Scaffold this active site. Sequence first.
Site, PDB file in Angstrom:
ATOM      1  N   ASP A  83      37.120  41.954  46.556  1.00 26.41           N
ATOM      2  CA  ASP A  83      37.647  42.489  45.312  1.00 26.41           C
ATOM      3  C   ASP A  83      38.239  41.415  44.412  1.00 26.41           C
ATOM      4  OD1 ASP A  83      38.901  45.069  47.432  1.00 26.41           O
ATOM      5  OD2 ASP A  83      37.031  45.075  46.312  1.00 26.41           O
ATOM      6  N   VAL A 104      40.102  35.519  39.988  1.00 28.15           N
ATOM      7  CA  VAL A 104      40.299  36.826  39.383  1.00 28.15           C
ATOM      8  C   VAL A 104      40.573  37.880  40.439  1.00 28.15           C
ATOM      9  CG1 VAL A 104      37.842  37.262  39.435  1.00 28.15           C
ATOM     10  CG2 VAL A 104      39.284  38.527  37.851  1.00 28.15           C
ATOM     11  N   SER A 105      41.392  38.865  40.094  1.00 27.45           N
ATOM     12  CA  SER A 105      41.679  40.006  40.949  1.00 27.45           C
ATOM     13  C   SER A 105      41.189  41.267  40.258  1.00 27.45           C
ATOM     14  CB  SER A 105      43.171  40.103  41.237  1.00 27.45           C
ATOM     15  OG  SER A 105      43.453  41.280  41.954  1.00 27.45           O
ATOM     16  N   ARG A 106      40.217  41.943  40.861  1.00 27.92           N
ATOM     17  CA  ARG A 106      39.552  43.041  40.176  1.00 27.92           C
ATOM     18  C   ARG A 106      40.312  44.351  40.237  1.00 27.92           C
ATOM     19  NH1 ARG A 106      34.930  40.320  39.937  1.00 27.92           N
ATOM     20  NH2 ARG A 106      35.459  38.948  38.185  1.00 27.92           N
ATOM     21  N   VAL A 107      41.298  44.492  41.117  1.00 32.00           N
ATOM     22  CA  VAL A 107      42.168  45.654  41.010  1.00 32.00           C
ATOM     23  C   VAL A 107      43.055  45.516  39.785  1.00 32.00           C
ATOM     24  CG1 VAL A 107      42.128  45.694  43.511  1.00 32.00           C
ATOM     25  CG2 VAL A 107      44.141  44.860  42.319  1.00 32.00           C
TER      26      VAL A 107
END
Lengths: 284, 117, 117, 136, 171, 86
Positions: E93, E117-120
Amino acid sequence: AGAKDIRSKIASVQNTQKITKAMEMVAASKMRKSQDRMAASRPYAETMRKVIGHLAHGNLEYKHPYLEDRDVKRVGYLVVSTDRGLAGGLNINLFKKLLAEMKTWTDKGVQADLAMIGSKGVSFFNSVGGNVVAQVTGMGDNPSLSELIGPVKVMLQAYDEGRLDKLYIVSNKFINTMSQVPTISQLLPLPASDDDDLKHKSWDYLYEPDPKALLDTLLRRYVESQVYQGVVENLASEQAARMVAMKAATDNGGSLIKELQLVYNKARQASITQELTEIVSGAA
Amino acid sequence: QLDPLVVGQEHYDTARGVQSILQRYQELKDIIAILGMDELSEEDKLVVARARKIQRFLSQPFFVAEVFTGSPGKYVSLKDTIRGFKGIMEGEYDHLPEQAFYMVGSIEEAVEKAKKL
Amino acid sequence: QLDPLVVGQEHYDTARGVQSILQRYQELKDIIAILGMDELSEEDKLVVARARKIQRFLSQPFFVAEVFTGSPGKYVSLKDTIRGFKGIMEGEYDHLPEQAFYMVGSIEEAVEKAKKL
Amino acid sequence: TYHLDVVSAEQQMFSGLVEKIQVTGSEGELGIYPGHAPLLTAIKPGMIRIVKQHGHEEFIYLSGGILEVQPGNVTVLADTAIRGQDLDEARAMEAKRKAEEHISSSHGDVDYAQASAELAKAIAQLRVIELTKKAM
Amino acid sequence: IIYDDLSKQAVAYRQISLLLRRPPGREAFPGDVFYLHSRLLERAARVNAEYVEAFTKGEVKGKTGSLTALPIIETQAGDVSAFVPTNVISITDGQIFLETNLFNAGIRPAVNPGISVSRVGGAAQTKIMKKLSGGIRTALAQYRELAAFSQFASDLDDATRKQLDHGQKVT
Amino acid sequence: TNVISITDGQIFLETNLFNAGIRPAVNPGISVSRVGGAAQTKIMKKLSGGIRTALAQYRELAAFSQFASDLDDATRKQLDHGQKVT
């Protein structure tokens, strides 16, 4: 070839593209600053030329060597050239125009003398055997009038000594950010350029001590100032040409990446296939 | 067979000069591709201008290719070609346009083709 | 193992200083090529001098390479290595010419070799 | 009051409205008040006295120039260095010398130097046009 | 849970696969190497309270369980596109990309913005931090290219010099 | 890659150098000889050390040859001595 060479080349070309984009930005700022410095010159030359209006070609006349169209036995040129490369064709278009006209003149048997501003022209005309009599170099992006006094002094001293019969300045003309044009234009004997003082018949000056002594220094200073104006316009033109040239080079790099990545992908695939067929057709 | 002891000094020396020019032209094509032809030294512009002539003068029309191009084929004798390449390399045909050399026989058909554009 | 906690701050700082000097000299080589030496600042010419002296002083003669060069080998204790590089970077030995440091061994041998040059 | 311009060939050094100025003209120290009749003269190096309307004085240093006066305009075409047949001849001698020894000073543009150096090193032995099959 | 270098579990699996003669795939990794990391990492999950209450037969009723996983991968000289790293980037994620250049330059931890990047997203971030940090990421992502333009340009517009100072402060 | 590992040295012959006219085309920057000076006559051992460095400095400078006119004579000396020894 092989993926690990082509990816290295792609990396290096992308770095090159960074370089040229930075140079385009820098040149685009320096062009603005240089053309501000280009518009900070007009007042001096314009007022001084109005003065020379009244004093010389007024209803009253005076007997100066620098206003009379004497005979041509040899001609002088003041050549403005950049100190830095990557300018596109600027310098060479200018030198080819100069050489064509200097050929046309020597076809009437007149000699010619060159005074060089900027080092690129110095090297070029040292190679082509031009007659360089004096030079100044390394002004860079900080042209100053005091440095120009030398060569223009030489050329004036040679003009009034009879050794020259006409004097030109050859330089680029900044017109548009996108278009500059090389020009050879005369500054001795002084051109006839309107500025009629018939309107100013209302007055005349108190000359201290006399008009001739002034008119001399007026014209000398005026020629120096037109040479300076030329140097500064040529500088702004150099910056514009470097800007456009680096733009073109950045787009060339951007296309070469498209070519290299197709070659790279083909090599990637071929290496996968040849590894896997060597494994599988090894077993059994 | 390309040995001085076999083809004689002049032919060997002409061949190696042509190779040297064309290689020096390959070494410039990356800088020309990136920065354009204007950033070259004033002597490199001459190397390029001569290589681009040598390339064409290596062209020739063939008798069996009239089918494709109409132009009649040519037969060029060796004596008559080492002279032409020695000329181009020495810069004595250095006042003639590139397309003057394209698809011609000896160097004298090129000097003629230049007159007609 | 190159972090202050284990090598001591003296050593760690001398090492990072050598790295800094050389990493700047790499920047400056390509100014010196285009513009020549004289356009540098006072401290830029001084950084260059110390960088070249450090780069020389990292060479050493070996007792086993004694057979290739004839010169006898040297053993340099860590105290003396740190003392030497720190002395060079501080500017204590700015008055010796570069070649006094090449293949010198210990730092005292530099001040001695400088006499005979 | 009247309007004063002090301009050099390179740049402009003053403008605006003034009450008087005092100028060491070639043939003797001089001082201009409004309405002054048309006049023209060289000037010597040294200070010039300006008093701006509302009487706020200020000095300027001029290396020379020409002073010119018209009905309501006065201007001073200053110049940037001491001009004199003693100094200009030395300048011209140096300029002739450099044409003989064939010297060239380096420009001072360190940024163009660094950019061009990185460009020259990046573009070397790139050999791309042999690798991509683009003909040219 | 922190798996140190799945990059080495992939290799151990490749070995213990080839020694059973099982037909290989790209880079000689077995066929189902994706289904190796997938059936592992898809266990890191946040499981809602009805699954907990069912699994535990009523003994706990309000809670939601969870299991966070931080796998580690080892690229070869920054090549994100290699087979296994791009398998795993497709499973997880987000990624925290640790940049060698910043690490050697002394920026530790050498977290690389822009490419990490952090998709949450902010849903996971406590409110105060979601407020204070909302700008940092892209401001730094821009500073790092602006300071790359810097070196070929002295005489900077101070509208950009403020930026090059601020970015350097925060870095 | 095997025989490069077995032998004591390598003479790398380059096709570009061979086209450009450099014959024999030995590439000095990647050719090696682990026996080295120990095998030379001591006159040659003396004299060739300076050729190594002349060519090494030339190979470090060579990138500028395509901007040469912009260079500084303090380096132009080296960049021409390299070409003459080559």
